[PDB]
Design a protein around this ligand. Structure first.
Ligand SMILES: *[C@@H]1O[C@H](CO)[C@@H](O[C@@H]2O[C@H](CO)[C@@H](O)[C@H](O)[C@H]2NC(C)=O)[C@H](O)[C@H]1NC(C)=O
Length: 242
């Protein structure tokens, strides 16, 4: 790593060890509290301190380390802060400098940054982020259903099974706004509805989902609703044919 130099004589304002939250730069302009207030205030270039660009943190002060995935930070942060449970740290895409005469934001190899607290974006319906500093919206296990930004999903009831709810009164499916606009195409819409078993069929298991075959031409998707034993009948709903 970098080695701090000895107490060599230096001109006034020649910082060699930046404060916590800033980084070392090499310029002759005036820099106070990490933001320039005057241009070319020194006869020669001088080592000075500049605030971290936000979304990055440092303790050494020799480099604005980008925040690790799942975290975020503001400008001049000494340590990143983790996104809460049920949220994912989505880094905001940056635009590279159009010209070299423009003041840069961060290093050229850094293209994404978690600029602010609002970068913590909730997992869509059907997903769940179960721990702090999460990195991926985990798809909910088959048979269970989740709400927006849930820290775990609950299973469907006895008489119902997990499937899509397009036709039902209250579709639990996440909207396109919080799937393909908040995120990219990484998290599509997942069925997270509980539909009751049809008439004369019963389902005595707690967590059940409608098995779906991706090759609809050969094998059609089927539901786990067990038929009632001959001689017994059941209304459209819970288990236990009478
Ligand atoms: C760089 O800018 C700082 C901040 O404006 C200057 O510090 C000021 O100096 C004047 C003159 O002594 C004081 O009256 C102000 O109170 C200072 N401001 C602050 C915020 O401390 C500084 O003089 C400028 N030039 C250099 C060479 O550092």
């Amino acid at each position: 790593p970098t080695n701090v130099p000895q107490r060599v004589p230096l001109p006034k304002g020649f910082r060699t060890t930046c404060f916590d939250g800033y980084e070392l730069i090499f310029s002759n302009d005036n820099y106070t509290n990490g933001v320039r207030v005057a241009v070319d205030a020194y006869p020669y270039p001088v080592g000075q301190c500049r605030k971290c660009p936000g979304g990055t943190a440092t303790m050494d002060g020799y480099r604005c380390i980008p925040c690790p995935s799942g975290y975020w930070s503001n400008e001049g942060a000494r340590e990143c802060t983790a996104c809460p449970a049920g949220t994912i740290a989505k880094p905001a895409a940056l635009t590279a400098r159009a010209k070299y005469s423009i003041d840069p934001t961060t290093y050229h190899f850094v293209t994404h940054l978690a600029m602010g607290p609002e970068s913590c974006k909730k997992c869509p319906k059907g997903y769940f982020q179960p721990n702090i500093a999460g990195t991926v919206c985990l798809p909910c296990p088959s048979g269970f259903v989740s709400t927006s930004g849930a820290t775990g999903c609950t299973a469907c009831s006895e008489g119902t099974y997990h499937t899509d709810g397009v036709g039902t009164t209250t579709p639990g499916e996440a909207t396109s706004l919080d799937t393909t606009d908040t995120f990219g195409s990484i998290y599509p819409i997942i069925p997270n509805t509980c539909r009751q078993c049809p008439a004369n069929t019963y389902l005595p298991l707690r967590g059940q989902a409608a098995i779906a075959s991706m090759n609809l031409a050969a094998v059609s998707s089927a539901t786990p609703c067990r038929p009632c034993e001959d001689g017994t009948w059941s209304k459209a709903g819970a288990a236990g044919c009478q």
